[PDB]
Design a protein around this ligand. Sequence first.
Ligand SMILES: *CC(=O)Nc1nc2c(OC)cccc2s1
Ligand SMILES: *CC(=O)Nc1nc2c(OC)cccc2s1
Lengths: 304, 304
Amino acid sequence: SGFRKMAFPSGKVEGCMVQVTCGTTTLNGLWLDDVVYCPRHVICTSEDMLNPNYEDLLIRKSNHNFLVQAGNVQLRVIGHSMQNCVLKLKVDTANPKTPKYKFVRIQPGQTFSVLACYNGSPSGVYQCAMRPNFTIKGSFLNGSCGSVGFNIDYDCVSFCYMHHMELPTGVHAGTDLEGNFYGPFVDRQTAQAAGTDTTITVNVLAWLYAAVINGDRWFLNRFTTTLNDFNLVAMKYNYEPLTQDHVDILGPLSAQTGIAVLDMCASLKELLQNGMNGRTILGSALLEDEFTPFDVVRQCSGVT
Amino acid sequence: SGFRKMAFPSGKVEGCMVQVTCGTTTLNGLWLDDVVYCPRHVICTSEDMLNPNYEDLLIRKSNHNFLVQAGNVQLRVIGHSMQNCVLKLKVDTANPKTPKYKFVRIQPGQTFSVLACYNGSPSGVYQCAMRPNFTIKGSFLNGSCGSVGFNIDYDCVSFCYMHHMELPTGVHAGTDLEGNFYGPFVDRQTAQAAGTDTTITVNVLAWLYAAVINGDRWFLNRFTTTLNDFNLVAMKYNYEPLTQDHVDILGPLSAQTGIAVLDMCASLKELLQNGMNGRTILGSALLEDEFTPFDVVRQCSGVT
Ligand SMILES: *CC(=O)Nc1nc2c(OC)cccc2s1
Ligand SMILES: *CC(=O)Nc1nc2c(OC)cccc2s1
């Protein structure tokens, strides 16, 4: 029993983090086989960041200007290229600690672990979600860029995020490992406002199932609802519309608890309309939306 | 910017987790040098757990009854002994992945990372605090016993917890790595109720400093207080009494923000008396008490 915001074990990713220095800019890179992946803005000064022309800035850069350091040993850069917003630095040595891995582009509402790194050294790990506005609410200080987000399926790391930007509102933007930004963000120090941070409805419901499973049941009520009726209330409270796809995804949690998805919807509807009245659910005073149904099943069943 | 509940990177501890099987009981062990540490109740059946005599149960056990498996390779047990509530299994092979480590017995209010393991395989990592009632609010399913809690200072793992027990109220009890229980708990399936779960006042204050640092300032007020006046309000709300030691520990956060500790106390006092009025602090609807002052400095300064 007990339900926690839980990150994947970080060991497999710790073994991939390097320091990348171009001129006087140092950030983190991901070393997989004989390639080091890092944000292309490693080539920028703070001046450059106001209006960078990356292709032009890159012409002034050779392999030997990219200093790659793995622990206290230097890697030899034998090639470099820009793919979207990342640089791929070919090194002469395959990372001996390369895990089985994939690059996946996640959808909003999907959760992943971040290994916060500074100077290629891991400082900590935490669980995030890709917000519906394609931001993440991270913990990222200067030097944190190139820190990655990942899921693990048994022994295979799926890398889904690389950290690039803080928005003036203190939320975070970055790319998949093909260097494509999540949402409309760019690696430019410019006016970039996030859209509405909507609540991931299917994740709240998943987490209400986790609560019932772990003994927190005070918010179960006598009501049901329909997707259309629920969705009217979702709209009002800036919750993502719930689809039949979400209902199907919650099927296993429905089965195990014996609470129909639409009944749990009715519980969520009353919680939105009435608030928590000073009560907590799994030690939270608000509705948690950064557990997926898959996360709840995993933690409630003990998958490794 | 951004402030997250952040665990230490788990790699150094992942490399220490083994499976320990005695008869039909399987749980996790910690392999440091040529010793495997595990809960002594690995020798118990569920029947045994109602009233175990461990010294008597142990006489029926030889080295070859303790099956230790590191990944898919078996370790040879060449000795065993009971120290308090842990078994120390001497194996013929030093763990090649042994990190620099210490065993530390933490005080209530101190935070640590847990690497949840099942069958010697890591499933996830999360941040805990030793509660003032010497419980922890973990996520621990069957097979989770022998999972450990730790802090990391640069390259040195300080192990402070090993998981032993779930209380019927769904909270968690365990030992330091000398096998001494935190609080009055025992490795017996008996009536064991936790005392008052008081709030760790110095940790809430630390986290209010983290909020100011990260831009959440709405709860700063025009008032100050004294330790004695604050403590009257703490008593009423089941908050730990604040000492001059706590004030001194908060000194660095005081300095960096320019908010005197006692002024932040006055902010906390108003929050206790008035509630949050439906507002959030660092994305929380309640006062977070599982960040230490040291945790806030570390995350706010980017230590690795
Ligand atoms: C996200 C992150 O760490 N960005 C960084 N940018 C710089 C920089 O830009 C001009 C100079 C020095 C270090 C860093 S880290
Ligand atoms: C905390 C934990 O995982 N305890 C376990 N106890 C047993 C047991 O006790 C009778 C039998 C089989 C497996 C486990 S794990």
